[PDB]
Write a protein that binds this ligand. Structure first.
Ligand SMILES: O=[N+]([O-])c1cc(-c2ncccn2)ccc1NCCCCCCN[C@H]1C[C@](O)(CO)[C@@H](O)[C@H](O)[C@H]1O
Ligand SMILES: [Ca+2]
Ligand SMILES: [Ca+2]
Lengths: 83, 850
């Protein structure tokens, strides 16, 4: 099944979700990467409050989530500090 | 309020020299004393009246340059010759006598086509390419050489003992066909230099001028004695290598411009750079004094500064403010209130008690800090720096042998003798992480007040008869004092890292050669629209003479800018090389998020444009570093035959690819943009609309407008993923913006490395890529095979302006199967977007549009 941008602008194949290229104008096709300028990355943050951060802060080398999951391929290893 | 600073008439040696008017020179060459040496031609000159004997040393140089040096034959005491400015002993070319008569000797450089005609009586030099006269020396008989005799001058309440008497030197140059001259910074004046006939000469003497005013020839903080001349037919350059106080007269007279240099001491030492193109002059001058140091990438981002941030907490609040308002920033600056009572290399024990922890917090944000270190050292027996320098005798001294003491920020202060190499080594070692306690690898340095500024000194600087290393007077060395500070600081940042990390040092005072050591800025400007305007011609005059890393305080240093002016200044600063906001102690806070949302949004937009162009900026500075080509350029450098560009100073180009016309008027509704070039096209980068040159286009603007055009035939690399600092971005993929020429072609380059070390040079760890478009194919190849780099950077997007819709798009990469790329096309704008090529930037590849 193909994926549809949440705003309703395009329909892209499922392998273009999180493929590190921005295909949706609202950023909805890249929730886990830094490819869209207006996207958001969700910190689950178990043991504290959940948090949304800018897509531009995924793998920027800076620890933005207390659970450290925004840095998964950047050379920065973030320890969990939610507690 | 300018009685503080001497006019030419109040400068006794300028008054003497300038009273000599164009006429029959009393100097004559004794052709009996001629000698062709292995490197030079020497011939005795004599003053017909005083019988003083001089020695002319004439040299043809490799790269089509001439050097003229004149000194006394048998002087009582040695004359100063400027050291440490030339990067090498200039390679000489062989001279030959190819013609002669009773009053002349014709010389040929190597085997042509350059010839030098020496006239014996009166003394004169003509330089020719074949049979075309390029320039003349002493054609108006203004040569003057006061020999060291067997005087005492007072200005205001300061007394110059002047123990060696009149020793000034001077010489004139005639430039036939030249009507436009440029250079000799630093002056708050127009790019095209004005004639001095009815007023003051241009003055070159590093001076601290409080609240300097516009459109006047007063000497400012730096002095680069280099003058460029441009015409439809040729370019030339004059490099007057003298470190003393120098005045420069300019007169126009078939069109011809005459240049006259007048210096207080030293020898006559001048380089003639014969072009023929302005890029040849760049290469020629760069071979003499070197090239722009390659800045670490972070220093090309945005710098947030003011006098002063309060304490560690304020600094961290500023850092967090950028992230909370989604605005990028690489460096936060610490002015003089961060130290213990203006004792440099210290920290205020109450407001900065844990500098390492502050620097660690900034490093966790991948940001840097800059701390100010001035050359004046507080006279204080509890200050270890002062105790060491005093005990080792490394201070500038007075004639009686005591250490010089003047007044500056910490009160009574002494001034280290930076002309002494032992002092520079001490200074450099002081930046070791053990010596400069509290510093860390992400702490860099700002050298200020290094003219040197002396509050209670004559013209707010050091006395002329202060004594330096080797016995030389301060009047001999003045204009290279700042450069020595800049140099010793930059070497200190290299040494503290074991020789691995590239430095960043901002300096206020400067000289020929300062481009080797970092950045400069135009000092204490004012929050006014005309100061915004004048930043272009000031940084352009610095670019032309090799200092590509130039900028002006964004927002103005003095006074409070209205929000609209601050927006326009961010837009202007975002396209200038050194991009720093700075402000006086008593101004209101103006961090960019403190403004109303409409002004914040325009400023954030300007910040995003700058950060996305960092690959482009970085490549231009690499070309400047390798070739000596200026980053920021006047339009006439790119269009030497369009005479309507010879004076333009409200527009500039970045490289050959981007033309910039920032809005610099309050409440403007539009701008007049001159788009030059026969058969040239220009793309509005905001709307993608194509415009043909040459024309003056009326472009309507709003608050968020920055008039920027990309030239047809160029390829501009961008990082479209703007992050919070450049360190965060330096592994990100590149988007290529292809602007098609009318012939359907384009070319561009891209430099990449680790962003902060000398590995690109010591290990050839870098990439230099060439991108070329022709026919219907975009090709990436290596522009330097010796460079390899481990990098995850890839090509994520290609934007082609002025292209039709293809039937299919095909990518071929060495090592991969041929693949198809999806694409989007806009028929209105003729813009083609190629989706995710996904190829490594280190790979050869090609994209074909079918
Ligand atoms: O003439 N005076 O008013 C005057 C006279 C005297 C005097 N005193 C004794 C005897 C005789 N005279 C002393 C001080 C002043 N005023 C000086 C304030 C102007 C600010 C310019 C400085 N800007 C510099 C420094 C810095 O401000 C902070 O390090 C950086 O922020 C800037 O970037 C940089 O350029
Ligand atoms: Ca995608
Ligand atoms: Ca992050």
């Amino acid at each position: 099944k193909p994926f549809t941008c949440l705003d309703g602008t395009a329909t892209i194949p499922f392998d273009q979700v999180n493929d590190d290229y921005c295909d949706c104008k609202d950023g909805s096709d890249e929730p886990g990467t830094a490819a869209c300028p207006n996207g958001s990355f969700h910190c689950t943050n178990t043991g504290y409050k959940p948090l949304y951060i800018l897509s531009s802060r995924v793998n920027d080398g800076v620890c933005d989530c207390c659970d450290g999951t925004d840095e998964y391929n950047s050379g920065t290893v973030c320890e969990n500090t939610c507690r | 309020d300018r009685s503080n600073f001497k006019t030419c008439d109040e400068s006794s040696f300028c008054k003497r020299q300038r009273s000599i008017r164009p006429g029959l020179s009393p100097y004559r060459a004794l052709l009996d004393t001629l000698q062709l040496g292995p490197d030079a031609l020497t011939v005795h000159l004599i003053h017909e009246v005083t019988k003083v004997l001089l020695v002319l040393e004439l040299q043809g140089l490799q790269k089509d340059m001439t050097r003229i040096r004149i000194d006394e034959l048998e002087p009582r005491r040695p004359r100063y010759r400027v050291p440490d400015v030339l990067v090498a002993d200039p390679p000489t070319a062989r001279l030959s006598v190819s013609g002669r008569d009773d009053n002349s000797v014709e010389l040929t450089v190597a085997e042509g086509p350059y010839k030098i005609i020496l006239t014996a009586q009166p003394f004169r030099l003509d330089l020719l390419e074949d049979r075309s006269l390029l320039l003349s020396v002493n054609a108006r008989g203004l040569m003057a050489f006061e020999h060291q005799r067997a005087w005492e001058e007072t200005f205001k309440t300061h007394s110059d003992s002047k123990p060696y008497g009149p020793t000034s030197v001077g010489l004139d140059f005639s430039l036939p066909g030249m009507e436009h001259v440029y250079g000799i910074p630093e002056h708050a004046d127009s790019l095209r230099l004005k004639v001095t006939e009815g007023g003051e000469p241009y003055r070159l003497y590093n001076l601290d001028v409080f609240q300097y005013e516009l459109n006047n020839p007063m000497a400012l903080y730096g002095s680069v004695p280099v003058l460029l001349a441009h015409s439809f037919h040729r370019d030339l350059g004059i490099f007057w290598l003298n470190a003393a106080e120098t005045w420069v007269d300019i007169s126009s007279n078939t069109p011809q411009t005459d240049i006259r240099w007048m210096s207080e001491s030293g020898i006559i030492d001048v380089f003639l750079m014969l072009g023929p193109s302005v890029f040849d002059v760049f290469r020629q001058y760069a071979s003499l004094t070197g090239t722009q140091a390659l800045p670490p990438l972070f220093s090309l981002g945005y710098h947030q500064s003011r006098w002063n941030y309060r304490d560690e907490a304020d600094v961290l609040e500023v850092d967090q403010g950028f992230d909370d308002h989604n605005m990028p920033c690489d460096v936060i600056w610490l002015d003089i209130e961060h130290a213990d009572g203006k004792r440099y290399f210290t920290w205020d024990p109450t407001r900065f008690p844990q500098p390492l922890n502050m620097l660690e917090h900034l490093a966790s944000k991948r940001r840097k800090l800059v701390a100010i270190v001035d050359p004046h050292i507080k006279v204080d027996s509890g200050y270890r720096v002062h105790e060491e320098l005093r005990n080792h005798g490394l201070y500038v001294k007075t004639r009686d042998g005591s250490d010089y003491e003047g007044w500056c920020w910490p009160g009574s202060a002494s001034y280290p003798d930076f002309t002494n190499p032992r002092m520079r080594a001490w200074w450099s070692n002081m930046f070791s992480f053990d010596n400069y306690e509290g510093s860390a690898p992400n702490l860099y340095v700002w050298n200020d007040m290094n003219e040197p500024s002396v509050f209670n000194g004559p013209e707010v600087t050091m006395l002329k008869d202060a004594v330096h290393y080797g016995g030389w007077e301060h009047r001999d060395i003045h204009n290279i004092y700042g450069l020595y500070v800049h140099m010793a600081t930059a070497d200190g940042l290299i040494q503290r890292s074991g020789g691995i990390e590239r430095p960043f040092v901002l300096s206020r005072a400067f000289f020929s050669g300062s481009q080797r050591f970092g950045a400069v800025w135009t000092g204490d400007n004012t929050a006014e629209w005309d100061h915004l305007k004048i930043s272009i011609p000031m940084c352009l005059s610095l670019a032309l003479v090799g200092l590509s890393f130039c900028g002006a305080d964004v927002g103005g240093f003095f006074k409070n800018p209205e929000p609209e002016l601050l927006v326009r200044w961010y837009q202007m600063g975002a396209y200038q090389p050194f991009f720093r906001a700075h402000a006086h102690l008593d101004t209101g806070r103006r961090e960019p998020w403190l403004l109303a949302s409409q002004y914040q949004d325009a400023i954030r937009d300007a910040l995003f444009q700058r950060y996305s162009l960092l690959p482009f900026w970085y490549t231009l500075f690499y070309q400047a570093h390798k070739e000596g080509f200026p980053v920021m350029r006047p339009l006439w450098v790119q269009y030497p035959e369009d005479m309507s560009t010879f004076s333009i100073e409200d527009q500039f180009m970045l490289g050959d690819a981007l033309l910039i016309h920032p809005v610099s008027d309050a409440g403007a509704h539009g701008v007049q943009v001159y788009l030059p070039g026969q058969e040239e096209v220009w793309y509005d980068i905001q709307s993608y609309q194509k415009h043909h040159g040459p024309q003056t286009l009326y472009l309507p603007v709003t608050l968020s407008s920055i008039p920027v055009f990309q030239r047809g035939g160029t390829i501009v690399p961008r990082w479209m993923r703007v992050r919070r600092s450049s360190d965060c971005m330096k592994d990100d993929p590149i988007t290529l913006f292809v602007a098609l020429s009318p012939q359907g072609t384009a070319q561009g380059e891209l430099f990449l490395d680790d962003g902060h070390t000398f590995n690109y040079q010591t290990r050839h760890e870098f990439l230099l890529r060439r991108f070329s478009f022709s026919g219907s194919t975009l090709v990436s190849s290596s522009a330097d095979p010796k460079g390899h780099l481990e990098t995850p950077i890839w090509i994520e997007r290609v934007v082609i302006m002025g292209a039709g819709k293809p039937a299919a798009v095909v990518l071929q990469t060495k090592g991969s199967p041929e693949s198809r790329l999806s694409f989007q096309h806009d028929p209105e704008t003729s813009v083609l977007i190629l989706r995710k090529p996904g190829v490594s930037v280190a790979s050869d590849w090609s994209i074909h549009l079918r």
